[PDB]
Amino acid sequence: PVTINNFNYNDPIDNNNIIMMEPPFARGTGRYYKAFKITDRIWIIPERYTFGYKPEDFNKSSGIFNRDVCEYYDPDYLNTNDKKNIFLQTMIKLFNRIKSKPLGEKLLEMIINGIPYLGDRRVPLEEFNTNIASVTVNKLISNPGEVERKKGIFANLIIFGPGPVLNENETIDIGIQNHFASREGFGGIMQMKFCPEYVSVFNNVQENKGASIFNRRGYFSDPALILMHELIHVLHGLYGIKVDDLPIVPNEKKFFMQSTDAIQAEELYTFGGQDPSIITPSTDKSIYDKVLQNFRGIVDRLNKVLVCISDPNININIYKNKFKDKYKFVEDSEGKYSIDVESFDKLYKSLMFGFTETNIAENYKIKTRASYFSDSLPPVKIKNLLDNEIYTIEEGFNISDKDMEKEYRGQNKAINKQAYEEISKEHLAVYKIQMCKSVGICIDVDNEDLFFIADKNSFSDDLSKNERIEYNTQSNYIENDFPINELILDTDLISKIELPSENTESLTDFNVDVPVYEKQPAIKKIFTDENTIFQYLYSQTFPLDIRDISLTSSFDDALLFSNKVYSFFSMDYIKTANKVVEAGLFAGWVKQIVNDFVIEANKSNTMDKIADISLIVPYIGLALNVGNETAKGNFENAFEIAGASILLEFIPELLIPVVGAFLLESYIDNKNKIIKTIDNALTKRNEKWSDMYGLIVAQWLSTVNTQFYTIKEGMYKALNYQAQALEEIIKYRYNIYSEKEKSNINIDFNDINSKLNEGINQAIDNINNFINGCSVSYLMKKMIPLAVEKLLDFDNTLKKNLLNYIDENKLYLIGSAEYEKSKVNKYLKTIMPFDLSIYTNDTILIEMFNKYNSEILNNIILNLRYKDNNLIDLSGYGAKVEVYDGVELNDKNQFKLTSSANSKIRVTQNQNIIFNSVFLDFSVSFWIRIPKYKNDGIQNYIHNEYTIINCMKNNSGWKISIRGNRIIWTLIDINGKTKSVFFEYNIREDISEYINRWFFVTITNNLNNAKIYINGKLESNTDIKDIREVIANGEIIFKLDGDIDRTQFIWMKYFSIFNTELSQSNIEERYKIQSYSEYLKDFWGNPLMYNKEYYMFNAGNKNSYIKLKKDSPVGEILTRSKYNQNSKYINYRDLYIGEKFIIRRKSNSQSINDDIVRKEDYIYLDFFNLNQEWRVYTYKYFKKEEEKLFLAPISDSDEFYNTIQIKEYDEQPTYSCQLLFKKDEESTDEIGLIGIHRFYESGIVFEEYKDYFCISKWYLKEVKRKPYNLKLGCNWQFIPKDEGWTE
Ligand SMILES: [Zn+2]
């Protein structure tokens, strides 16, 4: 158990638990400090830490000590005896809180028992030397006013009050002769400068501080956790494992880069959470090896220690027993000490990954920042930690009896205001970057606000070094994890070996290195004319002495005029915001503009499914202009083209080493040591794959995810600025009214802020999801593939290495040099799938990753889309696309392959994507339009098969071909085995749904089957179990290849590939998404156009057509003529028959050239009667359900409706459209829909039924039924002449 002593500052010195100490950095000179033993080996000195600091530096100045902290100064802190006592009682309380839980009590016990080794690197192996400043510290015994009598004491930790900056707690170790015992296995007296009242403040990005931006936000820290965080540094120092290694160093070459001190791995381990993942596996092992090496030395010393020259009264056995337990060494029956690999592993992991701030916070239910790299905020002062009503040993601030236990409410600034106080900005110093334009206007930006982008030097290159493989050689994995539960329940973690007595010989050798500190300018001036995130956010603010502002979409005007504030919202939002109204309409205006704000912010949930992008925040570019000028042009389009990359302020240069060669050692005649060498090289090979992935994750987190973090913070600010600006305008407009008017104005400001704040929170969730998706995207598409390239390169080199090895040793392997020959091929065949959960256990990061992987659209590895008269890959994997001269492209994403040799597309796929899942798993989707057969060429049409898309690599791969009316999917495994599946449409149908008409194809492949879907419907299936490995990432050639007719061609659109099997549901959705359009379509599926001759087709009367009746103004319905020749293979009804109609636009006299017909458009349905253009009319006064339509010259009669509204009542894909007659555009008086009705005719000669072109009110209710009735006679399609259809 741990005992916390009690005492008051004014208690008498007793030379035992209350002494006059001579601090290590005092150098044996100067005065002593009253010190109190809070627990064994731990001392509290309630005075300011002054070592290495200038007295005047305790005052706030124009300088700062740390560039990444909002430094609070207060020279009066601890200047009275009562203040000192308050410090003592507070430390006593924090220590009691720490030991209130097993985990903290164990941290304390480990610290108390972790006594420094008696000596350091300079001491001979056979001795203990207590006479060094890192082991012995002195206390003055003699009466006051004379250093006549001193006495030495061993100590582990000395805690002082703060140095110049109250909120900059720090643990310091003792260096002597340029070396640190606490970094070389010995350990040494540790010191700390700590302040309990002025705690740090933080806020979660992916969260919301009490869902309030108008109130105080963020949470304040629990000083007990702040203390335990420093105690962890102490722990590492005491065990001599606070080693230095390759540090994370920030890139500072650009003005937008954050400047900070180098960050050591030990600091990231101490914090825990995701930070350890920023330390590559290479560096993890390097640190591991150094500490292990350190322990080897200590254990050798324990085997050689014979005497303690400095102090004859030191019992050697007692210390050997204690050090044996401290380091978990094992001892044989004789007394020989050695390192037990298992116990060392556990101790190491316990100290570096068990005791972490993150683990402790979770355990004590204390909230803390998410990452080391999180924006630091202004500190706050805690009123009274000694008041159990505000802070308790058991629960800290989160007291259940006050209902502050849930959601860390007790630490919430917006909730527990009675626990803290804000700090005077006059006492705060912050390092700023003053960005000046070469003129001049200057903007100050806190260094904290900039982009932290780790420099390339931050990462180890140990992967490039060679590895010697032996029958011994084994894997080396360090789990940056440690079950806190076992640690808390570990039985032999805490020593039960006697702590030696602290009294010893006085220290006479005060030699020690004392650090010297000094402030640096708090402001650094830089020159740049860039208008990036910093300037854009600045343009959205206004001076405090201004109360009348107006919004503007002009960024430059906003920067120029102090009364102009930039807004990235809609033009309409901006105009309404600057609108002035009479008192009577003010409340209405407020409701309006506030509602408009929420609508604008809500646009952050915009979808862009047609471009294969589920979520897009359209205004991010306008708001920050971050990255590659995202404020210019249209952000959505730019994002579709480049993706996540356009938002990054900087594109990092990744460290992706060529893995070092393997040197296998031979064992002539040893059939076992040789077999092992091969197996070990395989396992080692996997270690290289995992390590490389770890190296990627570290760079991603410290150079890419950090930038996206800043963008997220940037948006939160931009949104808040917009709300702040609107709030300001509302206040001004309201205050212009007299008191009498205000009384009759119904307004509630709190609720206004409430609604605005709500809109903001909703937008933040959308933005956070968008940005996280962008970050994972960059990792997966821009980083992982580059690593894979090298790893595959390494594989090959290793393959020819192992084979050649099995050759030179063929003899000593006799009848097996073949069994393992393939053993190598099958091992280096399966690559290691990247799994982020292996490199980190951070819930937020894992969820980000799993979410990304659950989105089917991220499985797209090729997506050919039209852009600037060219086809490019928008999958984000950078496939190279060469479109030769003979290919026809249009902005409707349609491309035509002709019989010309230059009508070809060459696609070189990214060879670095896990495509060969070792069992064939991928899909191909695209739209196609295949022209009708030539009647006089039916034999060749049905006989000649021709390839259209070929993807072959090493005589293996896939292919898409066509033979007449059949489309074929062919696979060819490495063995040459071939399998096919096909879809054949009928060429004898009176009316075909497929011939010369756009339709949707999707082919899916999995371990068992090959399925072909047509317009979302499964059509074919083929068992492909026999088929073996299929190489699919070869070059893709789009070209008509075979014995074709010179006239042969094929149109295609939206060709894409997925590296997974699409489900019927995915396909249906894709079919629906890609079928969607604002415009109507024609019979062939192309956009319906105005001023274009069209024959009419009726879906309910397929074989019927309209013809102006000879003697009357009506359209009789006749039967379509048909294919007349004698071929047995074909049949069809003529399509180019009947009147030739032409659709004319109704509104705006923009002439009759041509344009796209959209749903709901008002039109005139005309047709050519010889050399004249006639019109389709509806007699206004009919009372029956239907009536025949009236066809006549163009004219305007009061008795006939002449205006039609083209509609689309079908919710599902169809090329059919409906034609509605309304009383007039405005009215909701529907006359009826155009269709076909049957009439009975009985005359003097003929008796029969005849159908006519009509209008019926009956259809009005029928088109509402679900599912939509495709057979309805009011369903029409327009057929223009098309080269793809001849009759
Ligand atoms: Zn730290």
Ligand SMILES: [Zn+2]
């Ligand atoms: Zn940072």
